[PDB]
Design a binder for this molecule. Structure first.
Ligand SMILES: Nc1ccn([C@@H]2O[C@H](COP(=O)(O)OP(=O)(O)OP(=O)(O)O)[C@@H](O)[C@H]2O)c(=O)n1
Ligand SMILES: [Br-]
Ligand SMILES: [Br-]
Ligand SMILES: [Mg+2]
Length: 272
């Protein structure tokens, strides 16, 4: 009689319905999927990721329909600066603390093509890492769903490679951690607790997401697998060709997580 995901999806569609159309749309994060370790009563932001055809024109059209989605700085940023500066290295731009119906929304915009390239090749890891956690689908298609699956499969290969103990919960934690290693906006103390608080409260969703019995098999709480990383996304595979170990894979990923979270936090003031 109550399906959380139908009720959230409807509310989010209301928000999007005042905004220029998108190719696909997804909810994620603590405003969409519960997390342990929040004090009740904390009203976290509803985090969304929207895929568009043309970054410049989606924003231009939304600056006329919803000008209050943007600071003064930010409108000039989106209308004046080069597309290369706007996309930056992650390809995604964030509007935060957007108020709608007693809630706060924070959405990111990414062009279709940058989404495809990043998901397939991991030349950037910022967005593909977020798609390794629970995703509420609002609007998608077969092709994008298959991108999402391959990205999880390759995350799972990397997870199995890094794992020391053959324990299921720790595979889920290792996977969920890939995009958090090296993140510059997470205080040191809370970094391990954030990952635990996500997996702890969405264990079911993780069960569905990483249900790949050709890579590893579940026996209660432990798993059996043989390491297989022979096909990985092209930029990480290129990076590791002479040193295919867990250490070099984590080197690549956390280097990207450090550089990208830092650039993403700078771009965020230029666009509020
Ligand atoms: N380095 C990071 C940071 C975040 N994410 C994912 O993307 C969402 C990021 O939303 P964010 O608002 O940063 O984290 P929240 O979990 O929503 O915490 P908060 O209440 O502070 O918004 C997270 O849920 C997490 O799954 C990630 O995978 N890698
Ligand atoms: Br568009
Ligand atoms: Br960037
Ligand atoms: Mg959030």
């Amino acid at each position: 009689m109550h399906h959380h995901h139908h009720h959230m999806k409807d509310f989010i569609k209301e928000f999007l319905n005042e905004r220029p159309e998108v190719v696909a749309a997804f909810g994620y994060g603590s405003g969409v999927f519960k997390q342990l370790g929040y004090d009740s009563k904390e009203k976290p932001q509803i985090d969304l990721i929207l895929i568009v055809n043309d970054m410049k024109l989606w924003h231009k059209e939304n600056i006329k329909k919803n000008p209050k989605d943007y600071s003064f700085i930010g409108r000039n940023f989106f209308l004046n600066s080069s597309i290369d500066e706007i996309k930056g290295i992650t390809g995604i731009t964030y509007q935060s603390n957007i108020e709608y119906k007693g809630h706060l929304f924070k959405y990111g915009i990414i062009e279709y093509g940058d989404f495809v390239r990043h998901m397939q090749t991991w030349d950037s890891f910022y967005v593909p890492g977020r798609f390794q956690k629970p995703i509420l689908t609002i609007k998608s298609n077969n092709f994008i769903d298959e991108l999402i699956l391959q990205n999880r499969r390759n995350a799972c290969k990397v997870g199995l490679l890094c794992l020391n103990n053959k324990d299921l919960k720790d595979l889920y934690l290792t996977i969920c951690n890939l995009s958090y290693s090296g993140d510059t906006r997470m205080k040191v103390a809370e970094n391990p607790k954030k990952v635990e608080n996500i997996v702890g409260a969405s264990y079911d969703k993780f069960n569905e997401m990483y249900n790949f019995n050709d890579l590893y098999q579940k026996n209660g709480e432990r798993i059996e697998y043989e390491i297989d990383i022979d096909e990985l996304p092209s930029s990480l595979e290129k990076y590791i060709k002479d040193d295919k170990t867990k250490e070099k894979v984590m080197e690549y990923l956390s280097d990207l997580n450090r550089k990208e979270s830092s650039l993403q936090t700078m771009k965020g003031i230029k666009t509020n």
